[model samples]
Target chain A: SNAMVDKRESYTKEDLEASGRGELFGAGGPPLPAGNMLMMDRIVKMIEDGGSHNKGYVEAELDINPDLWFFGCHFIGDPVMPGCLGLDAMWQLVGFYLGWLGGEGKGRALGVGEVKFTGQVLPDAKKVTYRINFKRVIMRKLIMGVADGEVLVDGKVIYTATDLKVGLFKDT
Target chain B: SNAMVDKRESYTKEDLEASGRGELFGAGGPPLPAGNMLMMDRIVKMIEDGGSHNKGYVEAELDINPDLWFFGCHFIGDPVMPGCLGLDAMWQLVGFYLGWLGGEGKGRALGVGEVKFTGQVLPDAKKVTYRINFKRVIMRKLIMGVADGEVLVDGKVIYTATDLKVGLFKDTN
Candidate 1:
C-alpha cells in the first residue's frame, strides 16, 4: 500500500548509505515497543546466528536488571521477576526476529497472540537469555507463525513458550 | 491440600477472623496473588451481589501514577503504562475477586495463563478502569477457573483478555 515504502527492502552493507537504520539492536524491538530504556538496557545482544538470513535460530540475552522499578511495583513481598517481564524480553526478541527478517515497525505492526508462561522467574540477581527458532515466516500476509521459545538462567531453563503468534502489518 | 485452604473459600464476616482476608475491594481474587499498593489503590469496589458467593463482578481504577519510578524506567520517551501493568491491574482484580470470594494468597498460589494484549496505554495522560466477571468457578482439585476482563480508557474498551486462568496452590513440603 501507498507505493510500497522502504519497509520492504532489506538493509545490507551496500544499502547502508541510504538507510541510516544500521544500528545492530535497532528497531527498539518489542516488550514495550521502541524507545523503552528498559528494553534497550536489558537487551545484551541479538545474535541471528546459525541459519539462513531471514529464518533461523535467534538468541538474545537480557539481564533482568533487578534494579528496575517494575520489580518493586510488580508484586507484593519479596519480589521476583514478574513472569511477564521475562516474557516481555522474549516478546521483544520476537519483534527483533521480525526486524531481522526486515521491517522496522514502519509499514509493519506486530500483534502478539497466545503466550504461555510455564515457570516463574526470579528477578534478584538474574540474567535471562531468550531463544526462539523460527524456520518459517508468512512473508507479507497476516500470517500466524509459531516459535518455540525458552527463558534460561545460567543454562537452566525455567520457562518455555509456544504457539506464540505474530501477525505482520505494514504501512497502508 | 490442607483442605484446599480457605484461599479458595468465600469470605463473608466470620471468615475475616482467621483471615484478615475478607476485605472488600481487596487484592482481586487471585491473579497477582493480591496484596500490593498498586492493586489496593486501583480497586474502587467489589460487589459480591447475586447468585454465587465465589463468583461476582469487580472494577478498579489505576491512574498511570505518572510520577512513579517504574514509569520512569518503563519507557524512554513518552512513557506508556506497560501492558503488563494493565494486566497486573487485571490480575490483582482477579485476586480481589478471590479475596472477596473468601481466599487469601496464603494457602493458594495463583499462576499466569494465556494473555493477549490488544492496545497500548499511554502512561502520561492515562488512567484505566478495569472490569472482570466470573460467571462460574471451576472448583476442581487445584481451583482453576476462568473470567472475562477488559481495560478501559474513558469508558472506551482498549483491551479484553479472555481464557484467563489461575490455580489454587498451598504448601506441600
Candidate 2:
C-alpha cells in the first residue's frame, strides 16, 4: 500500500510540474493576448490624460479571463472576484499615474469604507467588463478624488464601488 | 489682464515642478527613521509570506496628525487616507503572492465585498494594527479569509473591518 501511494505521489508531482511548465510558457499563459494588452494600455493612457487635465473620467473594459480565476477549475463554479483585489487594482492604476506625476510619497495609507458583491463571475461566460468613473477632485489638503464603477458578468451587473483616493503631491 | 494671469500661471508651474521634485526625491523631508522602516519591512514580509501561501490577510494602521491637514490646500480639511487605498494595498499584497504561486494567469482580477470604515484616521496619534487570518482556499471558486484588526488613534480605535474578502482568482497561465 505504501509503495502504491508513493507511486501515485510521484505521478502527481510529475503532472503538476508538467502543468506548471505549460501554464508558465504555454500558449494559454499570462501576458494576455494583444487585444487585451491594447485595452489596458488605453485605460492607462486615459487615466494619465485625466490626471494631467485635473478632470474626472471613467475607465472601463472587459475583465481579462486569466486575471479572474485560478487553474484546474471550471469558470462558472466560482464566479466572483474578491473585493480586496478590485480595490487594489484600482490603487495600482492610480499609483501608476501618481508615480509618474511625482506623487508617490504623497500617496499615503487610506482605509476602505463600504463594498458590495452582487453577482457571480463565470469564466466561460461572455466577456465581463468593468467601468470606473471619476467623481470629484479636491485639491486642498491632499489631492483627493472619488469615483464609482461596476463589474458586469455576462451582461449582468455583479459588483460596484464608490471608490476614493488620496493624491500626495510634492509639498512646496 | 492676460499678461497678469500668464505671469501667475508661469510662477505656479515653476512652483509645482520644484515641489514635485522635492517630494519625489525626499529633499528636506522628514526622516522615516530606521525603526519605522524596520517595522514596515516586517509588515511587508508578513504580507508577502501570507500571499505566497495563498492565505490572504487584512491589516489596518492608524494615522492622526494636525500638521497633515496643512500639507496641501486640497487636504485642508480631510485628514484621512481614503479607505479604498487601504483595500487596494491589501489586494496588491495578496495578488503578488497569488501570482507568484499560481503564476500570473491565476493571480488576476481582484473583486471586493462588504468593506466598511468604522472611524476616522487622525494624524499624530498612535496607530493600531489589525490583521486577517486566512481560513479556506477553494480552487478558482473561492478564497475565504477572516478580518480581525484595530487601528487606534489617540487611544481610540478609529477603524475596524470585518468580513474582508471573498472572491475568485483567474488563471492567466
Candidate 3:
C-alpha cells in the first residue's frame, strides 16, 4: 500500500500551490483539517455513512515532495501517483473504518485481485478525487470495498481502479 | 518511479544475507550489481539472449516478523506480500529494462491489464520468481511482455501473476 504520499512532483511550486488550493478550497473551502493531512478518519467516516469514501486526500504542503528521488532515480517525468500508494492509503482508510466498528485488530487484506491504470495522472492536477464504494461488509471478519478514483488533470478522470480489498478479522 | 533505494530496512539482517548469497552463489552467480541496481538491462539481456526473462530478479525483500512493525501491518495475520508491491516492482523493472533499451523516457507502460492471485504467500516462502515472456515487440514504440511469477513457499507456487506490461517506445517521429 504505497499510497501514503501522493507522488507527482514535476510541477513548479506555483503549480503545486495552485492545485493544492483548488483541491482544498476551489470546490469547497478546504475539506477540513487543512491541506497537509491525509484525512484518514474523514474518509473512513464517509465509507461508514454509505457515501463514496474519499480515499484520496493529500495535503499539498507536506514538504516531502512526492517527486523526491527514489532508488537513485527521479520518478518525475509525466508522473502518475504510484498505484501501490493508492492501495496502501485505501487500506488505511478501510482499516480505520473497520476499527471504528470494533474490528481494528481483526482487519487484514486478502490481496488485490485486479487493478487497472486506465489513464495518466499529471503533477499539479486540481481537485483530484478518489471515491470508494463498499461492495460488501462481512461483519468484522471480512469487509470488501471496491474503489474507482480519478486523478483529474483538468477536471477529467485520468485513472480509475476497480479493485477489491478483502479484510479478514483475525489476528495474524 | 520510486525505484531508487536499493537498501531497504524492511528485511532482517539474516534475510538480507540470504538474498546476497542467492545473488552471488545461487543460480551460478549472475554477477548482479549491488545497492539499488535496476535489473532492467539484465532482464532485457536475458530476453534478448533467449534466456529466461519472465522470472524477474528479486527486486527487494520484506521481512514480516513481529519486530518489523509497518511491514507486519501490510500482511496483518497472513504474512503475505502485498500484490501491489509486486506489481510496482514489476513496473519499475519494466522501466529499468525500457530505459536501458532507450525506451524509458517514452511514456509507455506494459500495463498490468489483468492479474489473478491463485494462492496465499506465507512468511516462510523461500523465493519469488517472475517468469516473463515477450509476446510482441511492435513498431519499437510498443512492446508486450507477459509475466507468470510464483512465490515459492515450501517449493510450491503459493502466489502467481498472469500480468502484462504494454511498453510504448518514445514516439520519435
Q: In terms of lDDT, which candidate is strongest? A: 1
Candidate 1's C-alpha runs over 4 A off are: A1-54, A62-74, A106-112, A123-126, A135-146, A154-156, A165-172, B1-40, B49-54, B65-74, B106-116, B123-125, B135-144
Q: Per-residue lDDT of B68-139 in model 1, one digit per residue for the tens? A: 545554443334455555665565556445544545342222334455555555544456778777655654
TM-score of each: 0.64, 0.37, 0.54
What is the DockQ score of candidate 2, to 2 decimals?
Answer: 0.07
lDDT of 3 by residue, A1-172 (tens): 2122222412234433442333311221111111221312222124244545433222111122344222122132233445454454455344434433333333344444445554543444333444455544544234443433332334455444445454534444
Worst 10 residues of 2 chain B by lDDT: B1-10
Q: Is candidate 1 or candidate 2 better by TM-score?
A: 1
**Model 3: runs farther than 4 Å from truth?**
A1-80, A104-106, A122-128, A140-143, A146-154, B1-45, B48-81, B95-110, B116-126, B143-155, B169-173
Instruction: Please write out the lDDT profile of model 3 over residues B1-173, one tens digit for every residue.
Output: 21222332133334334332332123211112222222121221233333245333333332233332223434322344555555554554444333323332333343454444445444554444443444333325344344444333334444445464545433312
Error of 3 at B81 (Å): 4.4
lDDT of 1 by residue, A1-172 (tens): 1222233212232222222232343433222343232332333333444333445465665556666555553444344555555555555455545655553342112224455544454565566677766545564555333455677776777766654445434321
Lowest lDDT 10-mer window, candidate 2 chain A?
Answer: A1-10
Task: Give the fraction of reference interface contacts each candidate recovers.
Answer: 0.19, 0.16, 0.16
Task: Judging by DockQ against the true structure, name the best candidate.
Answer: 1
The model with the greater lDDT, 1 or 2, is: 1
Residue A10 alpha-carbon offset, candidate 3, angstroms = 30
Q: Tens digits of per-residue lDDT for model 2 on B32-149?
A: 1121111111132334234323554434332434553212221222244344434433433333223222321222223443444545444544553434444444334343333333
